Amino acid sequence: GLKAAQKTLFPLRSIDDVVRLFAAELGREEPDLVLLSLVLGFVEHFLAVNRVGLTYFPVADLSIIAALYARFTAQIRGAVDLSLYPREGGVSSRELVKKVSDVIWNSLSRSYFKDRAHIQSLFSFITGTKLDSSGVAFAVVGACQALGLRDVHLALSEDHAWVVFGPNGEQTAEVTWHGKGNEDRRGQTVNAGVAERSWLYLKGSYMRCDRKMEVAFMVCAINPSIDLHTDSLELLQLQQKLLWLLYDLGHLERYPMALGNLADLEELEPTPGRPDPLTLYHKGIASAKTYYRDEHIYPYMYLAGYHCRNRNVREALQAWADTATVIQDYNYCREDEEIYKEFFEVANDVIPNLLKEAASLLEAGSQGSALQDPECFAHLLRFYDGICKWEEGSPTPVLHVGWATFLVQSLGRFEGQVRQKVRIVSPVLTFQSEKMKGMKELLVATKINSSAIKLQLTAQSQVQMK
Ligand SMILES: N#Cc1cc2cc(CN3CCC(Nc4ncnc5sc(CC(F)(F)F)cc45)CC3)ccc2n1CC(N)=O
């Protein structure tokens, strides 16, 4: 509107007043995305971007928020003439969605760093004419709600955002960019990406948000970071409370990554009487299994990261083996580079550092070490198996000799007598990839044959002539 009933909690003088606003909005038929995003971006601005003058909480006065809201609705209503796009069926057309996407896109500053913090909200859009990639998608959905287009909803993968709309909410449209130096496909469907079985489009098992999930998205999108070394405790507390509000109302049921975010917040500062972080990570994974065919990677990455921080080697390896078991049934496509980067960092940095510490601790007499547990060696092997299987049939390869050195080093952290105890069947482990099936021979020698490993992992045809 803003409607009279939306205004009665103002001014917001505290974290808990913001929470009350969210609770009130979530109790309405259609929570007001524009109002909520402006409020979050306002408080984020004054708690993370510019804390000059801060004494407790940046009071959000109705006059200030209403004026921001008016700037948004005036910009959208002036630019989008709904009479030019007649709505058949109480649903929107592709042309109308593209128009809204154009209006947001064309409003943005000509030149800015797209990867900077605090450019996610409508507050950034109105005051700085800056949005990040998924911020543009959110803004298009907020603009469509403001226009009365109840069918337009946010669609989310693990690295991208677009909208669904139209009859039965069955249409898809690109509304923002993806990555850096990819050609924009705004206006198009996502069918080619679903059909090529890329991770970016999750084989079609992406999130199709309702309004409540779009609220959850903006809450996950809060960025408490003040700088590299410093987070806003106020914004961490706000995000954590809003996530629990959403959780209690049922709106994180179909949002795996939000559960992982909340688990991470609880690890940092536990809320008395709430589920442990581990419980929450496992609920994230359950969500992915239940609603998204177990086709998501981050629920397992979140779990693994928690075990890695707690130096739980065994359970970190199991979770990373599970991440690889998901990825194996995708094709590695152009525009999947963020998930390649994650797997690369885990294989080539995180696991080696973890195993190096484990090796030192073993030398010092640790008992029950992952390095003496053949089931842990099997998890490491299943992690590599899934990466190798991922690469099979992909249009772009994954592995290269830069991975092989770390594989040899990681295998060698397990003594031969531990490695011997895994039974590789055609602990028991079965390999899905042809690369690992050929490597089986090499995996039990007391001294691993480094060169042969390297040849098998990279499928390098020849050794040096001279
Ligand atoms: N092990 C481990 C591990 C844990 C872990 C945790 C993270 C944390 N990120 C996990 C993903 C999370 N992303 C999200 N969280 C909620 N909602 C959304 S919707 C969306 C798509 C977009 F942006 F809208 F286009 C992304 C996304 C942002 C936080 C990143 C890499 C991680 N790793 C891999 C690593 N390299 O350490």
Side-chain angles (χ1 to χ4, degrees), residues 1-2 4-28 30-76 78-87 89-109 111-114 117-129 131-149 151-179 181-182 184-227 229-310 312-333 335-414 416-422 424-439 441-446 448-453 455-463 465:
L2 283 171
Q6 303 181 275
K7 302 174 182 183
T8 63
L9 287 162
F10 292 89
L12 314 176
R13 309 182 166 278
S14 61
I15 289 166
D16 288 346
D17 287 354
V18 178
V19 181
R20 278 169 196 113
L21 182 61
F22 275 76
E25 285 293 321
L26 285 161
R28 294 172 64 83
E30 281 268 324
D32 187 330
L33 298 183
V34 173
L35 177 62
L36 295 174
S37 182
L38 288 168
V39 166
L40 292 185
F42 171 93
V43 303
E44 176 162 327
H45 181 84
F46 290 109
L47 290 162
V49 175
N50 185 2
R51 298 175 60 92
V52 180
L54 178 73
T55 60
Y56 174 61
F57 188 82
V59 179
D61 294 301
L62 177 61
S63 58
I64 294 302
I65 297 301
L68 289 159
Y69 187 101
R71 278 189 80 179
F72 189 76
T73 59
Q75 288 176 27
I76 300 307
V80 185
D81 184 352
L82 293 179
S83 76
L84 305 178
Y85 307 91
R87 279 175 95 236
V91 300
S92 299
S93 66
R94 184 170 299 275
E95 298 87 357
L96 176 54
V97 173
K98 183 53 156 63
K99 180 58 184 179
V100 178
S101 176
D102 289 353
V103 165
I104 298 299
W105 174 281
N106 287 335
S107 298
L108 299 181
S109 295
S111 181
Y112 62 101
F113 292 106
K114 305 300 193 286
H118 318 297
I119 61 162
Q120 77 283 59
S121 65
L122 295 183
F123 179 96
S124 176
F125 178 75
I126 293 296
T127 65
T129 60
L131 285 177
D132 63 23
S133 172
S134 57
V136 166
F138 178 87
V140 165
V141 175
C144 287
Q145 178 187 50
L147 287 160
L149 313 177
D151 61 311
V152 179
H153 283 291
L154 189 62
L156 299 169
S157 74
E158 293 186 312
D159 196 45
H160 190 38
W162 62 92
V163 304
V164 292
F165 68 98
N168 309 308
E170 77 202 355
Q171 292 306 309
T172 61
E174 297 277 9
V175 298
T176 190
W177 69 94
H178 180 251
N182 301 316
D184 119 6
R185 282 203 293 290
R186 291 191 306 119
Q188 291 181 44
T189 76
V190 300
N191 298 317
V194 167
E196 63 184 13
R197 306 162 66 82
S198 64
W199 168 75
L200 196 58
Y201 298 95
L202 298 170
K203 292 178 276 173
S205 296
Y206 53 83
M207 298 176 54
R208 292 150 177 87
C209 292
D210 70 3
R211 288 272 183 261
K212 314 305 200 316
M213 291 167 68
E214 290 155 1
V215 180
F217 169 87
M218 77 172 88
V219 173
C220 287
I222 296 166
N223 191 342
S225 294
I226 287 158
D227 61 38
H229 316 286
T230 319
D231 281 346
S232 166
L233 296 177
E234 302 94 344
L235 287 171
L236 290 161
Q237 181 189 136
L238 178 59
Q239 183 178 48
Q240 186 167 15
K241 290 177 168 175
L242 290 174
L243 285 176
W244 281 121
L245 175 59
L246 287 158
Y247 177 95
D248 288 341
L249 294 168
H251 304 312
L252 306 186
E253 177 75 8
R254 309 180 174 227
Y255 202 155
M257 289 180 288
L259 298 154
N261 196 338
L262 178 55
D264 281 359
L265 288 166
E266 286 298 304
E267 181 193 4
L268 180 65
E269 177 104 290
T271 306
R274 288 295 189 172
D276 300 322
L278 263 177
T279 303
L280 291 159
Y281 294 118
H282 283 283
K283 285 177 178 318
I285 291 161
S287 176
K289 288 172 185 291
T290 295
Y291 299 103
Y292 301 111
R293 301 191 313 181
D294 209 3
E295 293 186 309
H296 294 189
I297 306 290
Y298 282 117
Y300 302 101
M301 290 285 189
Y302 269 120
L303 177 61
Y306 177 83
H307 288 307
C308 181
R309 288 189 297 278
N310 290 287
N312 288 326
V313 183
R314 178 176 282 99
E315 285 83 6
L317 292 167
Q318 183 167 234
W320 287 313
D322 291 338
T323 67
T325 292
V326 179
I327 208 63
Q328 75 180 344
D329 289 316
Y330 282 91
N331 286 340
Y332 179 46
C333 297
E335 304 202 40
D336 292 345
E337 301 73 28
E338 287 299 309
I339 208 67
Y340 177 86
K341 288 171 183 167
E342 303 292 15
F343 279 103
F344 187 99
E345 179 188 341
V346 170
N348 303 317
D349 184 57
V350 183
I351 282 169
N353 288 338
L354 191 67
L355 300 181
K356 176 187 177 184
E357 177 170 6
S360 292
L361 294 169
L362 190 63
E363 187 186 313
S366 71
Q367 304 305 315
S369 177
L371 300 181
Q372 291 187 322
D373 182 357
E375 300 282 3
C376 290
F377 182 63
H379 295 328
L380 180 69
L381 294 180
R382 178 158 65 91
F383 172 74
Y384 281 97
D385 189 53
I387 296 166
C388 290
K389 178 68 171 178
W390 181 30
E391 174 176 73
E392 297 183 12
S394 291
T396 337
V398 175
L399 292 160
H400 62 63
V401 69
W403 292 71
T405 302
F406 293 106
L407 173 62
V408 169
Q409 180 187 49
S410 297
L411 296 169
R413 293 288 190 200
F414 300 78
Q417 291 170 17
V418 179
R419 294 190 271 100
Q420 282 183 50
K421 298 184 170 86
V422 180
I424 299 168
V425 64
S426 305
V428 289
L429 179 53
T430 293
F431 288 141
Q432 298 299 315
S433 72
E434 299 300 321
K435 284 180 174 181
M436 301 299 291
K437 292 170 185 188
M439 205 187 286
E441 54 197 69
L442 301 179
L443 298 170
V444 308
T446 300
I448 295 287
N449 183 338
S450 179
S451 304
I453 298 301
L455 293 173
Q456 183 57 22
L457 192 73
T458 64
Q460 166 182 325
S461 290
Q462 289 155 119
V463 289
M465 298 187 54

